[PDB]
Amino acid sequence: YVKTWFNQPGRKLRRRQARQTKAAKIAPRPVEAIRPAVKPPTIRYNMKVRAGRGFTLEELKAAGVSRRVASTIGIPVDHRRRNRSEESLQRNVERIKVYLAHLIVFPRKAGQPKKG
Amino acid sequence: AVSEKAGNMCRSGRMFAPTKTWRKWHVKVNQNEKRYAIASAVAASGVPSLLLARGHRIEEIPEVPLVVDDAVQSFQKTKEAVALLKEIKAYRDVIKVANSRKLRAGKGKLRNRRHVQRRGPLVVFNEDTGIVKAFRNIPGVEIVNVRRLNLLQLAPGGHLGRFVIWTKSAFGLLDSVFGSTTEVAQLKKNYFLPENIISNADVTRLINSDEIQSIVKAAGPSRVKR
Amino acid sequence: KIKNKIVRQQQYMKALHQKNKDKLERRKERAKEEEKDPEKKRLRLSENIPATIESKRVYDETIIEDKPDEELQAELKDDEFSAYFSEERKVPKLLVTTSKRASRKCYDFASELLDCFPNAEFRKRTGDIEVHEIAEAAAKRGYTDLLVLNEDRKKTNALTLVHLPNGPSFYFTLSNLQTAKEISNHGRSTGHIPELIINNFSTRLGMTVARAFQSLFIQTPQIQGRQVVTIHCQRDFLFFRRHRYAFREKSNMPDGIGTGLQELGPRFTMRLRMVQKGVWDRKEGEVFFESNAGEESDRRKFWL
Amino acid sequence: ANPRQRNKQRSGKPRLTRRNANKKAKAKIYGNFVIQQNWDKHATLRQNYARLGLLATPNYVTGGVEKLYPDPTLDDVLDKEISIAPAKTEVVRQLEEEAVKKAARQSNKMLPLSAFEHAYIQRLINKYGTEDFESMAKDVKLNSKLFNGSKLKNLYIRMKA
Amino acid sequence: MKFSRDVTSSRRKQRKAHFGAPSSVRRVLMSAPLSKELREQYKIRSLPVRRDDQITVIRGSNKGREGKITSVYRKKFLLLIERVTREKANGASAPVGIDASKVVITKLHLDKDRKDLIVRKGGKV
RNA sequence: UUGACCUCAAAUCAGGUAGGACUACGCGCUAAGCGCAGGAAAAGAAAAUAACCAUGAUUCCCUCAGUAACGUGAAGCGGGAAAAGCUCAAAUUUGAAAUCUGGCAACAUUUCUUUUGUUGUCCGAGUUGUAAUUUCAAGAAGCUGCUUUGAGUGUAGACGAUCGGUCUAAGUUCCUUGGAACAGGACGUCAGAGAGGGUGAGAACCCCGUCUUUGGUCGAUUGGAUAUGCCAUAUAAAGCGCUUUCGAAGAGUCGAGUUGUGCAGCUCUAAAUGGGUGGUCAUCUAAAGCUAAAUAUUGGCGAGAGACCGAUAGCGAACAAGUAGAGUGAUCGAAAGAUGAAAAGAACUUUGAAAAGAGAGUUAAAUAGUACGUGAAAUUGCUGAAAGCAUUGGAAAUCAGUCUUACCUGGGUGAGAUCAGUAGUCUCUCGAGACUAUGCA
RNA sequence: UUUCAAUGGCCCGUCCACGGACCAAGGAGUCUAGCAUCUAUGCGAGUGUUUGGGUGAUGAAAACCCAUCCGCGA
RNA sequence: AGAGCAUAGCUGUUGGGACCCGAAAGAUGGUGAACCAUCUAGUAGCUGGUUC
RNA sequence: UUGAGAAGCUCAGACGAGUAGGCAGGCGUGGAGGUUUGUGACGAAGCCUUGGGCGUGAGCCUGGGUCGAACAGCCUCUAGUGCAGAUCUUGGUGGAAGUAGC
RNA sequence: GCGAAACCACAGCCUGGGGGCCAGG
RNA sequence: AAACUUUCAGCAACGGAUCUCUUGGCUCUCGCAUCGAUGAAGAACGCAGCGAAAUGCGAUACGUAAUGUGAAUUGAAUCAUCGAAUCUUUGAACGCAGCGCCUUUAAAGGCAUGCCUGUUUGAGUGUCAU
């Protein structure tokens, strides 16, 4: 059995079109969600900064985004991750603040019943 | 490859070591060797004797490198493009290509490779505002962006010296695409043009110079008597 | 239509067998009713004549009627060949010549042509003399017809003759040129003048050629030598044969008298390619007749 | 090769040929209207987003970007209030205003009262006043639904408008 | 050069599609140019042939001949024209067929559908 | 004597559903056998790693790494693709079973008279528990004041998707060869089209197409949005402030002993700051459940390609091909492509019982006649000639090529040009070419 | 070319034996991964774009570009 | 007071069917009362062959 | 003196068996890119030929006959590339032999 | 009248010396 | 001498090599997701064209309706589209393997098993109340 890679450029194209399809659907908003900055978990890589999964509940509380409305504006929430140091908290609280600085959220239609 | 279910000496048997799809079809070249060959192929395109040696009919081209105005980028009709090549006298190469269209010799024309012909001028543009469609039907003519020069189109067959018709903006961006030997390329990261083993490639100029002919011992005969 | 080879061969075999059966049955029943009633036997035999190219020859009005025509005889009594056919009876004097620098193969055929014609000369073509210059030179030397045997690559492929001094010039391409050795049951010719017979030259262009060939031969054959030279035009192919003939009994012949032919040679064929009015100049000759190849593809269309 | 595939070659019935092979075909933008009216159907979504003044990714990019032209603290990061950001292009400006104007149109989030609610709060008000909501809550004869003082305040505040 | 990956440049597929084309597709494949006058008055370059059309043979051994199309032999992509025949050995006049592109239409058999086709295909009756 | 419930039956009662086939890719039991799926399947929101500044469902790719471990052979981390989270059981709605299938009757609705619902009513299910609320990331119950809100139904237009129809540039001019012009030459044309195929030989302009088309137009089916109309059971439902109040968490399982291949069998069989797994600490929170995408795909419905094969090749099969044929059967399984541009497939006459033959005739070609393109060798017949491996030559037969017309010199006669004690034009860079006059020293 | 003359001339492959009736066609060191040396090439205390991302309007499976890693070396 | 890394070619060698053909078995699943289909290109110190 | 394809030209001298084995240069075939203003219905390819020529050779060029639609040189790329044999595979055809025999 | 098949490097005069080589018959 | 035997050449056979072709195979890529008790896959039997050792179709038997092109085949079509019809005997095959049965007027509609939900009718020295 040999796995042959003749579809390496046909995969590349298909993934671009899936990105293009994803935009066509939600084109005013980014094709990817925002991610936190986390430090890799070892003595070898702990000096790097890499993308995490989602923001902690302490980070969202401090920024001002409740865990319910966080996902609706494309802010992932990782309940598993936590903040053992203040550096990670303030690094990612600022990240949410900057993202909200550039956010234009378009109003939705709200039910307004005639009576009380 | 052949089918995996399809001795080798027996009729209606199977062939020896049948072909497999997992042969090595593609080959890697160091990206610096790829860039060196593109630089060498472009530098050769500016030598008129290498263009003639490759088969191009450039005997009445006004100047090599042949660089035209940026009005050519906004050509709309093939008539305007066929007209331009005629005033700059690049159309004789197009006559060479158009007249050279033959049927292919072999089984290769049973496999969608029906016709063969020579290669005409390579128009290198900077912006596409109509130039590609105005030129793409003239036989043998190829158009390419100056940001994406192809070695397949710059040395067809591995033979150096393609006839390239640059536009003014394409020619202006050549120094940003390739850089200098001392200064870097703007459109390639950390890239410098290759350095040469010799300085002046005219070796007969070195040999027959006053520097070297003033200290050499007096030469014996050429072909000597018996 | 059947793209299976075997089936279409079996389908043809069944079709062929049925076609042969019912054509035989039709033939058998027709035979039975014809032997019973001859009034339809020769009735069929008188209309169902097999067709042939000569019977299906395309119509040309230039074919002259067998009855004499005054207008043709008015034009033929004062033309170039008239001095041969008039009361003057000028004895022909032929000049035979090959192309420049010919081989022994050309002469081994020119000798046979010399045997066919008494009192005919042969000057080997030498130097820078031209056919339009030999004609003038032979005209002042008493010759009346010059034949030039053209060869290249050791084969005599053409024969141009000019009627002296300004008579029409004809260009022929010889073919199937056989010498007396190559002919089975041949003979040795004598010095007797041959007798010429010409057949099947119906078109008016045919008479121009027939008079040209007639003018070569002496008008009084020596019958006691019983040598006959035949020029026959079939489907525009002119065949030249020479024979020895001796009359004897023949049960198949109509009157009981028939002749036995012994071939003398040479044996060859010609095709008339060009006729010019005047001395033969290849570049500036006034073309009387040019043979268009694309028009000769009709096997039923002849100019001779 | 297969018998099902020879079934179709040896039959005169045409194939269900569907001609939907469009390569280099990009997806057309439904979704927004302002984005649709400013979308170059040739350019990539990265180029189209960048030209429009939007962000395709709020994260990094995992490759080199296209270069066409030779271009020449806890308390401070927690209590800071960033004052939005400028809109680089006119399309982003157009998106910003329409969203603000659309908020103005649908800006009456405040609710009117109903007949039941008005008589409920009014009857409690006439007996207890308009300031002692704690004693209002502790009443059970009038506050039958047993609303707390916070729901009574909203009823009182809402009744005026 | 074709740019569409919906159309095939494979010779095997083009040849299969031509010869295995159905009779409705063969109706378009047998098309003849109109004469200059019809071309310059109906504003249509070429139409599919029909029975009872007056044509002139333009190419071949029967060049210059005219006549009405007696029938269209769509199976062999051949046209049949009045008096453009060949005599057999027995004396029968077996018709000879010509390709529809090798003739030219000099007088159209104008049905109502052609006129609707004419106006639809940029024409003016 | 009656009734209620329970349990077990019957019905050709009403409404359903299961089977069999395919199986490339999936998941199981045990390559094969057996079982079961889908457009993917499986897996999946930690009884997961780690020992760090910690990470954060799953899957896939790269790397780790041929490393550790015991020749086998990973995994944590790291880089990437795609990203999405949730539902119950266990707590009284207890101021109200708030829940649901079905029948019947209306009404609406449709990819659809075929579909799918709404409302009303009646029976049944259900308190041995159907809803709401809650899922540990929590959460309930109070209290508080800030912000929030449609499982409704139309119309309108725009943007999208699918399906069918429709819209489109230019030579068949002249000459030669040919059976045929699609060839050669001359002269034109179109080009967002000079892909490919067809047509009697190499066709951008004869024809279908191709390009435009990453599109105008016309039907029809629908996506998610937008604008707006009418309804809206809100006495409602949420998010986040606070707490002198509470906070349930899955057992013949985990675990232990022993056998067979973690799993399974058998014996025994738990706990509640417990239990699992790592280095007292850390970290998870099993024994219940669902879940797109990124991934796979020798099958299905279709496409588009190719430095592939070219009729003993390529699939066994270019054609009749799983066919003919073989075998009781399971199974096994071939050989076989090409006349010509057009059948114009050979009229007719004649011989023969026939098969066919010979005259003929069609074709450019019959050295294309279906035993048909080309038609090799082995091989066979006839005729002709000679005779009874190498070296070298003879005889016989055959063959190759082989030159004369030019060089110089003299004169006569006219010719002109690159000549003129000569005049102009065009293109290049004074004079260099090309010319048109005029003269002939 | 055929034949004659004078001279020489013992059947080929294979390992005595084994294969050989003749002719045509087919018929056997292949592809791929690892390693080692040698040569060429590019760069050089560095080096390697092609897991993937960007991009490619003429074919878009190409060519072009490159973030973060990672290998081997030091 | 570092010479390596990459790519390509030749050569060697190791593993894959591994230069080609040729070896007595056996296993899984069936058919008929041994046979059949896969595994299977089973096992090679060997035989015969291996192209200008 | 023109004789630099410096990878060219030119001078001299010696040498020549060859299995295993090593090294080098060449000839050929199918397909690929480039090229020859390449060849071709006024005849491509193939095949036949006591026609001619070149090369030590592998081989190549050509005349004639046959034929009827495509083909080749040169520079690189590539490979299912070269047969006398394997009691090789397939097909065709022999002597045995008009024998044995019915 | 019908009609194989196996097999076949090549072929078929002896003597002697080393079924074709050498010298003779 | 001749036959015979051999060799060579020519012509005629034989054979089907070569060359050229090619609606075929093989390989890679891309797009999509749709069998069956509402009778599948497969098998048999018919129908008319025919060459069937092929194909289409089902007693409405190359198919009928509707739509489209618009005038054949060798409101046409051996056409295309295709939403309506129809679709023999079998086969998971389902009344039992001709034989039967139930209902309605020889014809028509039905008659398999397991399970789910419900409906109706029965049984219990099953329990309980009056």
PDB file of N, CA and C (backbone and C1' of nucleotides) in Angstrom, chain A residues 26-30 102-107, chain D residues 29 31-39 48-49 51-55 84-103, chain F residues 225-226:
ATOM      1  N   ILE A  26     -20.836  34.565   4.693  1.00  0.00           N
ATOM      2  CA  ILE A  26     -20.712  35.584   5.730  1.00  0.00           C
ATOM      3  C   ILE A  26     -19.598  36.516   5.338  1.00  0.00           C
ATOM      4  N   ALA A  27     -19.747  37.215   4.227  1.00  0.00           N
ATOM      5  CA  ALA A  27     -18.647  38.033   3.707  1.00  0.00           C
ATOM      6  C   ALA A  27     -18.255  39.310   4.431  1.00  0.00           C
ATOM      7  N   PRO A  28     -19.177  39.915   5.186  1.00  0.00           N
ATOM      8  CA  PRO A  28     -18.671  41.110   5.860  1.00  0.00           C
ATOM      9  C   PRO A  28     -17.833  40.741   7.075  1.00  0.00           C
ATOM     10  N   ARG A  29     -17.853  39.492   7.526  1.00  0.00           N
ATOM     11  CA  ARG A  29     -17.167  39.130   8.751  1.00  0.00           C
ATOM     12  C   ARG A  29     -16.059  38.128   8.465  1.00  0.00           C
ATOM     13  N   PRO A  30     -15.031  38.084   9.314  1.00  0.00           N
ATOM     14  CA  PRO A  30     -13.810  37.362   8.955  1.00  0.00           C
ATOM     15  C   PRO A  30     -14.055  35.885   8.704  1.00  0.00           C
ATOM     16  N   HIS A 102     -12.361  47.160  16.815  1.00  0.00           N
ATOM     17  CA  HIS A 102     -12.567  47.126  15.379  1.00  0.00           C
ATOM     18  C   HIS A 102     -13.868  46.453  14.980  1.00  0.00           C
ATOM     19  N   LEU A 103     -14.722  46.116  15.936  1.00  0.00           N
ATOM     20  CA  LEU A 103     -15.920  45.345  15.649  1.00  0.00           C
ATOM     21  C   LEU A 103     -17.077  46.271  15.303  1.00  0.00           C
ATOM     22  N   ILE A 104     -17.732  45.987  14.183  1.00  0.00           N
ATOM     23  CA  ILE A 104     -18.952  46.661  13.760  1.00  0.00           C
ATOM     24  C   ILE A 104     -20.045  45.602  13.764  1.00  0.00           C
ATOM     25  N   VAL A 105     -20.869  45.574  14.805  1.00  0.00           N
ATOM     26  CA  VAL A 105     -21.934  44.581  14.912  1.00  0.00           C
ATOM     27  C   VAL A 105     -23.230  45.188  14.393  1.00  0.00           C
ATOM     28  N   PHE A 106     -23.848  44.519  13.441  1.00  0.00           N
ATOM     29  CA  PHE A 106     -25.006  45.040  12.722  1.00  0.00           C
ATOM     30  C   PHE A 106     -26.293  44.707  13.463  1.00  0.00           C
ATOM     31  N   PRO A 107     -27.156  45.692  13.709  1.00  0.00           N
ATOM     32  CA  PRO A 107     -28.340  45.454  14.539  1.00  0.00           C
ATOM     33  C   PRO A 107     -29.288  44.442  13.917  1.00  0.00           C
TER      34      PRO A 107
ATOM     35  N   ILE D  29     -20.999  36.616  -3.940  1.00  0.00           N
ATOM     36  CA  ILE D  29     -21.266  37.091  -2.589  1.00  0.00           C
ATOM     37  C   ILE D  29     -22.752  37.396  -2.452  1.00  0.00           C
ATOM     38  N   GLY D  31     -25.433  37.342   1.079  1.00  0.00           N
ATOM     39  CA  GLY D  31     -25.089  37.711   2.437  1.00  0.00           C
ATOM     40  C   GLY D  31     -25.233  39.192   2.682  1.00  0.00           C
ATOM     41  N   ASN D  32     -24.192  39.961   2.394  1.00  0.00           N
ATOM     42  CA  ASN D  32     -24.327  41.405   2.457  1.00  0.00           C
ATOM     43  C   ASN D  32     -24.680  41.973   1.090  1.00  0.00           C
ATOM     44  N   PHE D  33     -25.177  43.208   1.099  1.00  0.00           N
ATOM     45  CA  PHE D  33     -25.415  43.957  -0.126  1.00  0.00           C
ATOM     46  C   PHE D  33     -24.336  44.996  -0.391  1.00  0.00           C
ATOM     47  N   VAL D  34     -23.849  45.666   0.653  1.00  0.00           N
ATOM     48  CA  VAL D  34     -22.760  46.623   0.494  1.00  0.00           C
ATOM     49  C   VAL D  34     -21.480  45.916   0.075  1.00  0.00           C
ATOM     50  N   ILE D  35     -21.258  44.703   0.580  1.00  0.00           N
ATOM     51  CA  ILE D  35     -20.100  43.920   0.166  1.00  0.00           C
ATOM     52  C   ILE D  35     -20.271  43.414  -1.256  1.00  0.00           C
ATOM     53  N   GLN D  36     -21.494  43.038  -1.633  1.00  0.00           N
ATOM     54  CA  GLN D  36     -21.730  42.539  -2.984  1.00  0.00           C
ATOM     55  C   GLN D  36     -21.503  43.623  -4.027  1.00  0.00           C
ATOM     56  N   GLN D  37     -21.881  44.858  -3.712  1.00  0.00           N
ATOM     57  CA  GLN D  37     -21.744  45.952  -4.657  1.00  0.00           C
ATOM     58  C   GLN D  37     -20.324  46.486  -4.750  1.00  0.00           C
ATOM     59  N   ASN D  38     -19.407  45.991  -3.923  1.00  0.00           N
ATOM     60  CA  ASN D  38     -18.013  46.409  -3.949  1.00  0.00           C
ATOM     61  C   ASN D  38     -17.080  45.209  -3.988  1.00  0.00           C
ATOM     62  N   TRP D  39     -17.489  44.136  -4.647  1.00  0.00           N
ATOM     63  CA  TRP D  39     -16.711  42.909  -4.714  1.00  0.00           C
ATOM     64  C   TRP D  39     -16.206  42.723  -6.137  1.00  0.00           C
ATOM     65  N   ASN D  48      -9.964  41.091  -1.858  1.00  0.00           N
ATOM     66  CA  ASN D  48     -11.227  41.809  -1.778  1.00  0.00           C
ATOM     67  C   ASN D  48     -11.473  42.358  -0.382  1.00  0.00           C
ATOM     68  N   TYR D  49     -11.185  41.575   0.655  1.00  0.00           N
ATOM     69  CA  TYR D  49     -11.306  42.086   2.017  1.00  0.00           C
ATOM     70  C   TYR D  49     -10.354  43.250   2.240  1.00  0.00           C
ATOM     71  N   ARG D  51      -8.871  45.288   0.065  1.00  0.00           N
ATOM     72  CA  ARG D  51      -9.286  46.468  -0.681  1.00  0.00           C
ATOM     73  C   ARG D  51     -10.485  47.132  -0.026  1.00  0.00           C
ATOM     74  N   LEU D  52     -11.446  46.334   0.437  1.00  0.00           N
ATOM     75  CA  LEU D  52     -12.634  46.856   1.098  1.00  0.00           C
ATOM     76  C   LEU D  52     -12.343  47.453   2.461  1.00  0.00           C
ATOM     77  N   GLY D  53     -11.156  47.240   3.011  1.00  0.00           N
ATOM     78  CA  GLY D  53     -10.860  47.776   4.320  1.00  0.00           C
ATOM     79  C   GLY D  53     -11.289  46.909   5.475  1.00  0.00           C
ATOM     80  N   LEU D  54     -11.485  45.618   5.248  1.00  0.00           N
ATOM     81  CA  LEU D  54     -11.886  44.674   6.275  1.00  0.00           C
ATOM     82  C   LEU D  54     -10.731  43.743   6.604  1.00  0.00           C
ATOM     83  N   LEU D  55     -10.925  42.948   7.648  1.00  0.00           N
ATOM     84  CA  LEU D  55      -9.971  41.926   8.044  1.00  0.00           C
ATOM     85  C   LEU D  55     -10.535  40.563   7.681  1.00  0.00           C
ATOM     86  N   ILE D  84     -13.046  52.867  19.762  1.00  0.00           N
ATOM     87  CA  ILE D  84     -13.309  52.289  18.446  1.00  0.00           C
ATOM     88  C   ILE D  84     -12.038  52.392  17.608  1.00  0.00           C
ATOM     89  N   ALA D  85     -12.186  52.649  16.310  1.00  0.00           N
ATOM     90  CA  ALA D  85     -11.059  52.762  15.397  1.00  0.00           C
ATOM     91  C   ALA D  85     -11.544  53.431  14.122  1.00  0.00           C
ATOM     92  N   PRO D  86     -10.679  54.157  13.419  1.00  0.00           N
ATOM     93  CA  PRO D  86     -11.094  54.777  12.157  1.00  0.00           C
ATOM     94  C   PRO D  86     -11.376  53.742  11.079  1.00  0.00           C
ATOM     95  N   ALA D  87     -12.246  54.121  10.144  1.00  0.00           N
ATOM     96  CA  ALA D  87     -12.645  53.267   9.029  1.00  0.00           C
ATOM     97  C   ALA D  87     -11.834  53.658   7.799  1.00  0.00           C
ATOM     98  N   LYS D  88     -10.894  52.794   7.412  1.00  0.00           N
ATOM     99  CA  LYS D  88      -9.899  53.166   6.410  1.00  0.00           C
ATOM    100  C   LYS D  88     -10.534  53.478   5.058  1.00  0.00           C
ATOM    101  N   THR D  89     -11.474  52.652   4.608  1.00  0.00           N
ATOM    102  CA  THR D  89     -12.084  52.845   3.299  1.00  0.00           C
ATOM    103  C   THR D  89     -13.500  53.388   3.436  1.00  0.00           C
ATOM    104  N   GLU D  90     -14.080  53.742   2.288  1.00  0.00           N
ATOM    105  CA  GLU D  90     -15.444  54.255   2.256  1.00  0.00           C
ATOM    106  C   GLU D  90     -16.485  53.156   2.419  1.00  0.00           C
ATOM    107  N   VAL D  91     -16.173  51.925   2.013  1.00  0.00           N
ATOM    108  CA  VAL D  91     -17.107  50.824   2.223  1.00  0.00           C
ATOM    109  C   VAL D  91     -17.287  50.552   3.707  1.00  0.00           C
ATOM    110  N   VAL D  92     -16.191  50.551   4.466  1.00  0.00           N
ATOM    111  CA  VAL D  92     -16.296  50.356   5.907  1.00  0.00           C
ATOM    112  C   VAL D  92     -17.019  51.526   6.551  1.00  0.00           C
ATOM    113  N   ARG D  93     -16.808  52.736   6.033  1.00  0.00           N
ATOM    114  CA  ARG D  93     -17.576  53.878   6.516  1.00  0.00           C
ATOM    115  C   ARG D  93     -19.057  53.707   6.212  1.00  0.00           C
ATOM    116  N   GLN D  94     -19.380  53.190   5.025  1.00  0.00           N
ATOM    117  CA  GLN D  94     -20.776  52.962   4.669  1.00  0.00           C
ATOM    118  C   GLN D  94     -21.409  51.903   5.563  1.00  0.00           C
ATOM    119  N   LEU D  95     -20.672  50.835   5.867  1.00  0.00           N
ATOM    120  CA  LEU D  95     -21.177  49.831   6.798  1.00  0.00           C
ATOM    121  C   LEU D  95     -21.400  50.422   8.185  1.00  0.00           C
ATOM    122  N   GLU D  96     -20.489  51.285   8.635  1.00  0.00           N
ATOM    123  CA  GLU D  96     -20.597  51.850   9.974  1.00  0.00           C
ATOM    124  C   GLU D  96     -21.842  52.712  10.123  1.00  0.00           C
ATOM    125  N   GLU D  97     -22.112  53.588   9.151  1.00  0.00           N
ATOM    126  CA  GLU D  97     -23.234  54.511   9.304  1.00  0.00           C
ATOM    127  C   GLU D  97     -24.565  53.777   9.223  1.00  0.00           C
ATOM    128  N   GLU D  98     -24.733  52.912   8.223  1.00  0.00           N
ATOM    129  CA  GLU D  98     -25.989  52.181   8.103  1.00  0.00           C
ATOM    130  C   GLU D  98     -26.304  51.388   9.366  1.00  0.00           C
ATOM    131  N   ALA D  99     -25.283  50.850  10.034  1.00  0.00           N
ATOM    132  CA  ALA D  99     -25.514  50.137  11.285  1.00  0.00           C
ATOM    133  C   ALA D  99     -25.936  51.090  12.394  1.00  0.00           C
ATOM    134  N   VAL D 100     -25.363  52.293  12.425  1.00  0.00           N
ATOM    135  CA  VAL D 100     -25.785  53.283  13.411  1.00  0.00           C
ATOM    136  C   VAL D 100     -27.196  53.768  13.104  1.00  0.00           C
ATOM    137  N   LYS D 101     -27.471  54.074  11.835  1.00  0.00           N
ATOM    138  CA  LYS D 101     -28.814  54.502  11.455  1.00  0.00           C
ATOM    139  C   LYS D 101     -29.836  53.395  11.683  1.00  0.00           C
ATOM    140  N   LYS D 102     -29.481  52.147  11.368  1.00  0.00           N
ATOM    141  CA  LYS D 102     -30.405  51.045  11.628  1.00  0.00           C
ATOM    142  C   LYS D 102     -30.687  50.890  13.114  1.00  0.00           C
ATOM    143  N   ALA D 103     -29.719  51.226  13.967  1.00  0.00           N
ATOM    144  CA  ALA D 103     -29.969  51.222  15.404  1.00  0.00           C
ATOM    145  C   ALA D 103     -30.950  52.317  15.794  1.00  0.00           C
TER     146      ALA D 103
ATOM    147  P     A F 225     -31.143  33.996   7.712  1.00  0.00           P
ATOM    148  O5'   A F 225     -30.464  35.300   7.107  1.00  0.00           O
ATOM    149  C5'   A F 225     -31.175  36.524   7.062  1.00  0.00           C
ATOM    150  C4'   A F 225     -30.520  37.506   6.131  1.00  0.00           C
ATOM    151  C3'   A F 225     -31.174  38.870   6.048  1.00  0.00           C
ATOM    152  O3'   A F 225     -30.815  39.722   7.116  1.00  0.00           O
ATOM    153  C1'   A F 225     -30.769  38.078   3.876  1.00  0.00           C
ATOM    154  P     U F 226     -31.901  40.718   7.739  1.00  0.00           P
ATOM    155  O5'   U F 226     -32.199  41.746   6.562  1.00  0.00           O
ATOM    156  C5'   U F 226     -31.192  42.624   6.085  1.00  0.00           C
ATOM    157  C4'   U F 226     -31.688  43.460   4.932  1.00  0.00           C
ATOM    158  C3'   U F 226     -32.965  44.243   5.173  1.00  0.00           C
ATOM    159  O3'   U F 226     -32.759  45.442   5.889  1.00  0.00           O
ATOM    160  C1'   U F 226     -33.115  43.136   3.109  1.00  0.00           C
TER     161        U F 226
END
